Write a protein that binds this DNA or RNA. Structure first.
Lengths: 92, 92
DNA sequence: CTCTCGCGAGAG
DNA sequence: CTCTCGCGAGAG
């Protein structure tokens, strides 16, 4: 798995969260994003038995890598929170 | 309320979260930080009746301003999450 | 204390 | 969908 320039070309480049939101929407379905978390961890505040499974970590790192080259002043942990925020955008 | 250089001089300058953690520890008690949130909002996941009151928003903005001048590549919303993380560091 | 990170209400 | 932001387990 490698993100291609034709996928990046279709994404907002003004702000990293806007870039991640578009790029994630290019790569993944709303249903996929609604039912996955970044890491597959159980939430400290979930009483629910069911836990969302993780994203593919190779895909995570490709997304971070592409984002880091467009937004080199953004750190790794910030981009990880941006991915999590986009997944959460798909859960209402 | 104005943060002075003698307060900033005592803080880690390598990373913004480390700078915020030190600066907050210079300004505030552990008990204060344990019992306040950034905004005073009720948590979506709190079943507790009791809600932590907000920080003084003039103090928040002075902290953000000092941080922004040391870490100009850090955005406003990131620094706000860093303040929240330091408050949370004092709650165990 | 410290960091990470899924939750989810509420406002848009 | 989107952002903000307090929670808090678990690992350090």
């Amino acid at each position: 798995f490698q993100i291609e320039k034709w996928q990046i070309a279709r994404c907002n480049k003004s702000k990293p969260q806007k870039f991640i939101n578009d790029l994630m929407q290019v790569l993944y379905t709303n249903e996929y994003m609604a039912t996955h978390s970044l890491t597959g961890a159980k939430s400290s505040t979930s009483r629910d038995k069911a836990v969302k499974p993780a994203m593919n970590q190779n895909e995570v790192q490709e997304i971070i890598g592409v984002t880091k080259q467009l937004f080199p002043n953004t750190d790794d942990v910030s981009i990880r929170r941006m991915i999590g925020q986009k997944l959460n955008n798909c859960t209402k």
